[PDB]
């Protein structure tokens, strides 16, 4: 209706004003503020583990996998390289321009390899064991696996580049993908066709254009939105779908219909799931009920401190690997809330209660559209790469001053 | 001496109390539908709907006071596939807004002009073509259906200065254009290239093509003249095959291009002599940016005056206009009239003032 359109316009105006307000709290809450606007709109993010800090160049060679989610103009797959201020940050150093601590000019966000894609790029999950290979999800029934080394750079004015490795196991459009850090290969994808499909990958055949699905997990009644493995144990993973069940499935269980863990864990739609390597028991999951709840593997029936801070469906959750009791979540409410456990179930001052739950520690509000993906940096302590639907990729580090003394 | 007699019926005023420039009737309303007219002024545009028995009522009002906006033109048109009237307003920032009173919401905005739009007219055969004369020393033709710039009239030898106003021929084949360069240069739309461009714009799709629409820059006009008007010209009409352009000389000269016996459609571009045939003379009409609108039947031509008087003319009797005709005076006419509009049936005439105070008249009929 006309009133609905006017309300949406007012909402967009207020979102813009809130984002403008949030931009001002960059230094007092973050260590670095790096936001890059990709030409092709970003739908996913990742952090390559490559690093290089040469003498005389204090920056570290950091690579991040961007995305491409425009309708159809020679669809690509962007891979760029970024830097880091390092210990010698040198904010001014009387010579900042590149800066005195890292590259602040010329190739700040320069693109290294741009392999052409066929359709849309949903996820850009790579294999940490062999960072050369990168998998992609497309609206078609097949997945795309590329290689930024073998494929030439400087794309020609053409399209439909052959990735030499297409994983065709799905039926409808997909939106999930995850690799196995423990074992090279073993990529699984959760799609919209009420199921999650996994590929063996690993030692894929040379020029393996046609790749069938090694395994398919069809146990959720409603549409799935994420599928993530377990860092500590590679023999199980969790499947989360719109059906009110953040199910966890153990691999090699000879049961593709009944998940090992069948606890509902919610009364509404659920669209996110992840765990923590340092804290194996900690496992945050996102949901439409705006009540993302931490769970323990040993005791899942009992409900721990449900972080009552979301306001919409949550599509992406991830706990910080380096720390011990740090978790985070993001979804359609365009907020990246970072949880905490030390303050959970403990007394607090009335101001702390007014600010929110003590367990909720950090919340990131630097998005205008729905959050597509977010991930911590394996090398840097607090650097996080979060992306939205407004073709904005954000690289920032949560301030560690709160964890002082 | 004339056979017409209009009488004042009703009048009103606007909330914003600012000068009103452009006022036109809804000629596209057929019989049975009561007359409806619009008016502009300041940052708040207003409509009106006056019934019989000397009663005027307000239908709708709008406002655009978000920024320092202004409005000058109130060209009337309609949508063929929708069949609701539309009103065109532009100025200040130069954005052309197509207001839809039926749904009470703007339909389209046009940007690209280097300054404020001064006048607007609509093409008779195809009601979706708008003649926009911008102040950036150029004139442009807009296709409303596709929202594309059909042609940019002006260039190497076109529109040395701002084009104040422009008109259309009776059949829509030849286009006149006055301006501030003391020039009555003319751009025909009769060339085969004009037809090709119009057809391409009709079957154009900006989404389909990556390249921008190839507008036809008509640098060289087909016919231009300077000697007719010593000063800048701000009004022009097409009395059949003749020209009824008007300037600040308190006269609307009725002239014909070229010699006497030569056909107008066969005039060579190199012609450099003009002849004057008619000239309607009044007084106290030396202000700038004021427009006149004649009746559809061409028997009536009216031009508002700054003092407050009104003039009507007879343009159908044998030989060009002569004698003195008659003048219409209102009891409460104190401001400056900037535009006048008749109805499709020659029975209703409304004159706007410099305070958005419409004065509707009615003929005996």
């Amino acid at each position: 209706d006309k009133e609905a359109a006017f309300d949406d316009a007012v909402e967009e105006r207020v979102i813009n004003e809130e984002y403008k307000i949030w931009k001002k709290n960059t230094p007092f809450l973050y260590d670095l503020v790096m936001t890059h606007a990709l030409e092709w709109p970003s739908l996913t993010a990742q952090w390559l583990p490559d690093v290089t800090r040469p003498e005389g160049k204090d920056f570290s060679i950091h690579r991040l996998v961007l995305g491409t989610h425009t309708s159809d103009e020679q669809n690509h797959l962007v891979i760029a390289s970024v830097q880091l201020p390092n210990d010698d940050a040198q904010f001014d150093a009387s010579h900042y321009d590149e800066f005195g601590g890292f590259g602040s000019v010329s190739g700040k966000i320069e693109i290294e390899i741009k392999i052409n894609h066929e359709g849309e790029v949903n996820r850009a999950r790579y294999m940490p064991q062999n960072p050369c290979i990168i998998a992609t999800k497309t609206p078609s029934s097949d997945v795309l696996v590329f290689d930024y080394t073998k494929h030439p750079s400087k794309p020609d004015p053409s399209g439909e580049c052959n990735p030499d490795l297409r994983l065709r196991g799905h039926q409808k459009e997909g939106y999930g993908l995850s690799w196995n850090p423990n074992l090279s290969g073993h990529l699984l994808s959760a799609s919209d066709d009420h199921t999650i499909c996994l590929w063996d990958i690993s030692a894929v055949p040379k020029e393996g254009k046609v790749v069938d699905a090694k395994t398919i997990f069809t146990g959720h009644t409603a549409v799935v939105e994420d599928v993530s493995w377990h860092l500590l144990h590679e023999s199980l993973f969790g499947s989360v779908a719109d059906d009110q069940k953040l199910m966890i499935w153990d691999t090699r269980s000879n049961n593709t219909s009944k998940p090992s863990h069948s606890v509902d864990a919610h009364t509404a739609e659920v669209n996110c799931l992840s765990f923590n390597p340092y804290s194996e028991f900690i496992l945050a999951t996102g949901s439409a009920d705006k009540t993302v709840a931490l769970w323990d593997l040993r005791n899942l029936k009992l409900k721990l401190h449900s972080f009552e801070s979301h306001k919409d469906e949550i599509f992406q959750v991830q706990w910080s690997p380096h720390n011990e009791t740090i978790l985070a979540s993001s979804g359609t409410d365009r907020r990246l809330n970072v949880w905490d456990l030390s303050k959970i179930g403990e007394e607090q001052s009335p101001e702390d209660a007014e600010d929110g739950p003590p367990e909720l520690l950090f919340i990131h509000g630097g998005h205008t559209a729905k959050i597509s993906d977010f991930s911590w940096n394996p090398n840097e302590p607090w650097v996080i790469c979060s992306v939205s639907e407004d073709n904005i990729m954000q690289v920032w580090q949560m301030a560690e001053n709160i964890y002082n003394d | 001496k004339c056979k017409y007699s209009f009488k004042c019926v009703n009048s009103l005023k606007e909330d914003h109390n600012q000068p009103l420039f452009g006022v036109q009737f809804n000629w596209h309303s057929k019989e049975g539908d009561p007359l409806v007219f619009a008016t502009v002024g300041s940052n708040r545009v207003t409509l009106y709907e006056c019934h019989s028995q000397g009663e005027i009522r307000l239908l709708q009002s709008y406002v655009d006071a978000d920024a320092d906006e202004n409005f000058y033109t109130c060209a009337w048109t309609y949508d063929s596939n929708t069949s609701h009237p539309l009103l065109a307003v532009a100025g200040s920032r130069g954005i052309i807004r197509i207001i839809n009173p039926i749904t009470m919401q703007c339909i389209k905005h046009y940007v690209g002009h280097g300054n404020a739009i001064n006048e607007l007219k609509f093409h008779p055969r195809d009601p979706n073509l708008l003649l926009s004369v911008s102040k950036d020393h150029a004139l442009r033709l807009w296709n409303i259906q596709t929202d594309t710039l059909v042609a940019i009239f002006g260039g190497v030898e076109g529109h040395r200065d701002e084009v104040l106003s422009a008109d259309y021929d009776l059949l829509g084949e030849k286009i006149m254009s006055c301006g501030m360069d003391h020039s009555l240069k003319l751009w025909r739309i009769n060339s085969k290239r004009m037809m090709n461009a119009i057809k391409e714009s009709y079957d154009y799709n900006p989404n389909k093509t990556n390249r921008p629409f190839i507008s036809q820059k008509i640098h060289f006009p087909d016919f231009s003249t300077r000697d007719i008007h010593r000063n800048y010209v701000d009004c022009v009409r097409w009395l059949g095959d003749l020209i009824l352009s008007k300037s600040c000389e308190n006269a609307i000269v009725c002239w014909k291009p070229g010699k006497m016996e030569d056909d107008i459609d066969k005039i060579k571009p190199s012609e450099s002599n003009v002849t004057i045939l008619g000239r309607f003379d009044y007084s106290q009409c030396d202000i700038w940016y004021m427009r006149f609108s004649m009746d559809f039947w061409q028997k009536m031509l009216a031009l508002g005056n700054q003092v407050g008087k009104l003039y009507v003319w007879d343009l159908e009797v044998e030989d060009p206009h002569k004698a003195k005709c008659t003048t219409l005076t209102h009891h409460k006419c104190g401001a400056a009239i900037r535009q006048t509009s008749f109805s499709r049936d020659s029975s209703i005439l409304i004159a706007v003032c410099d305070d958005a105070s419409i004065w509707r008249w009615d003929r005996l009929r």
Binding site: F6, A9, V10, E17 | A67
Partner: protein, 109 residues
């Protein structure tokens, strides 16, 4: 220097914001009797208990309705609730302009 580009906000949303503020102030008196940081209300005796009273509160989905003893009702008939203490489930129903999902109509999943 170059002036501000344009006021993206408050072009037309200002009137809607004013209307919502007027409605909230009239209905709840949050800024009138709620001290500026809590939701005020006026309760009426919807029912009672043999002895108490049921001092139901007028703003639905804004101020929850509870029970009060006869002396308790007669003394604290009016109850003011802190905004962060307000229920989150009915927060969306309290006002529709606090959070609206624009791109959730299509795409999304």
């Amino acid at each position: 220097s170059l002036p501000r580009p344009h006021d993206f906000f408050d072009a037309q949303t200002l009137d809607a914001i004013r209307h919502r503020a007027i409605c909230f102030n009239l209905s709840a008196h949050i800024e009138s009797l709620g001290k500026g940081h809590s939701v005020v209300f006026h309760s009426t005796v919807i029912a009672k208990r043999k002895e108490k009273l049921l001092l139901h509160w007028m703003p639905e989905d804004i101020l929850p309705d509870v029970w009060v003893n006869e002396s308790e009702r007669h003394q604290l008939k009016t109850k003011v609730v802190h905004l962060s203490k307000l229920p989150k489930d009915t927060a969306l129903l309290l006002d529709p302009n606090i959070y609206r999902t624009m791109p959730q109509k299509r795409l999304k999943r």
